[PDB]
């Protein structure tokens, strides 16, 4: 496996380079290295091939190079749209291909987004199936770090909460979700249940009550 750095950070407008180091028998003695782009949840995209060449449709801001046993992918005029995982693939000997571990590109100087929070109460249908689930949906926040807490009336609930780790949205922001699992009796017994979402010093508290 070719060696790539885990992450590479850069400010907008700057020019950044991702390395890909193999041996002499692969990337050392052959100009047969391609680069691919992958947005979270999506399929890889042809970016560079044969070290230097660009496929049609690919932005001219992407350029490849090679020295000794190392390939490099260079992005100029850095944008948020370039935030992704980038992979290099090279000829590996005996008519094989070898791939690199990939590299996450982070674009600094990126500002801040406040989370949007939507709280759904259990459905009459789930309630009839003798179950209850509160659904908290958090989205469009940046950076991708958030703490979610649940409350019964005004005292904390930790039992049966199951919260996701933030995941990169398509608009370079983040989404997450939290799920409070409950019994119908519990749902009915209380004045309210709350999902409070804390994101960089600020807190949004959404609250639902039984009908």
């Amino acid at each position: 496996a070719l060696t790539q750095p885990a992450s590479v950070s850069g400010s907008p407008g700057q020019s950044i380079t991702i390395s890909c180091t193999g041996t002499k028998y692969d990337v050392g003695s052959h100009d047969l290295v391609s680069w691919y782009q992958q947005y979270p949840g999506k399929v890889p995209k042809y970016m560079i091939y044969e070290v230097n060449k660009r496929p049609s449709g690919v932005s001219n801001r992407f350029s490849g190079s090679k020295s000794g046993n190392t390939a490099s992918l260079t992005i100029s005029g850095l944008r948020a749209e370039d935030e992704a995982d980038y992979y290099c693939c090279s000829f590996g000997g005996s008519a094989t291909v070898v791939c690199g571990g990939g590299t996450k590109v982070t674009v600094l100087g990126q500002p801040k987004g406040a989370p949007s929070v939507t709280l759904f109460p259990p459905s009459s249908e789930e309630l009839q199936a003798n179950k209850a689930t509160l659904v908290c949906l958090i989205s469009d926040f940046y950076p991708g770090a958030v703490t979610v807490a649940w409350k019964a009336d005004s005292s904390p609930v930790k039992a049966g909460v199951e919260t996701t780790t933030p995941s990169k949205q398509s608009n370079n922001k983040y989404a997450a979700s939290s799920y409070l699992s409950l019994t119908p009796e519990q749902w009915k017994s209380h004045r309210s249940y709350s999902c409070q979402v804390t994101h960089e010093g600020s807190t949004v508290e959404k609250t639902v009550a039984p009908t």
Binding site: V43, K45, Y49, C89, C99, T118, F120, T211
Partner: protein, 230 residues
């Protein structure tokens, strides 16, 4: 206009075998090499093998040399990958791609030139049992949305393994749809939500149905979502 269509998601017990299909279209099947790669969660691309659609000749990577078999059906233009002796290490998304141009002169089988990719095939290899989903409607809430607009959705609860896909009105509704990543619960089962922002004025007259597809367990659910009352 080139599109590579892979088979659907699969669940397999450890030690079994799996066969994934890929049907490329928009070009001549026997003009380009087919490559097979995979992505294990947390990791990155792993090249598995290549196949010549014209002659049928295949070459595999070293770590897969006994376990993989790539074949083709030239009559329908479909490549196949068979992987055997499955373990948790084979749990990954499997891709088939197009390689170089096939020529009588010069070998381009090993050119890492993958222009076109399949949509992916998620394999989960586990001794656990396949769990189908329960689907519940999330009634419209205007409380936290933008102007004369409300938010409704679907809760896809307690299934295994990944993945499920959600559409709306049989694919007719794509605007304002956010299908969230699933949570892995301590029960070992997955749950996700799909939420749509729709106009408030059109409620009562517009129909909202979520189409939940969980191919590993062979379940389709069409859930109608309508406002509540009190």
């Amino acid at each position: 206009q080139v599109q590579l269509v892979q088979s659907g998601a699969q669940m397999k017990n450890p030690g079994a075998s799996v066969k994934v299909s890929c049907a490329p279209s928009g070009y001549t099947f026997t003009d380009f090499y087919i490559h097979w790669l995979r992505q294990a969660p947390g990791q990155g691309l792993q090249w598995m093998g290549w196949m010549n659609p014209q002659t049928g000749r295949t070459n595999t990577a070293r770590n897969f040399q006994g376990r993989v078999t790539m074949t083709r059906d030239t009559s329908i233009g479909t490549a196949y990958m068979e992987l055997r002796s499955l373990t948790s290490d084979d749990t990954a998304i499997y891709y088939c791609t197009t390689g170089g141009w096939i020529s009588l002169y010069y070998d381009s089988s090993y050119y890492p030139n993958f222009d076109h990719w399949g949509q992916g095939t998620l394999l989960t290899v586990s001794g656990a049992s396949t769990k189908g989903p329960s689907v519940f409607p999330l009634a419209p809430s205007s409380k936290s949305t933008s102007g004369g607009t409300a938010a409704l959705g679907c809760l896809v609860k307690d299934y295994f393994p990944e993945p499920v896909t959600v559409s709306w009105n049989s694919g007719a509704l794509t605007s304002g749809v956010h299908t969230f990543p699933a949570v892995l619960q301590s029960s070992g089962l997955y749950s996700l939500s799909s939420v749509v922002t729709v106009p408030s004025s059109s409620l009562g007259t517009q129909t909202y149905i979520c189409n939940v597809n969980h191919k590993p367990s062979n379940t389709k659910v069409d859930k109608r979502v309508e406002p509540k009352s009190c």
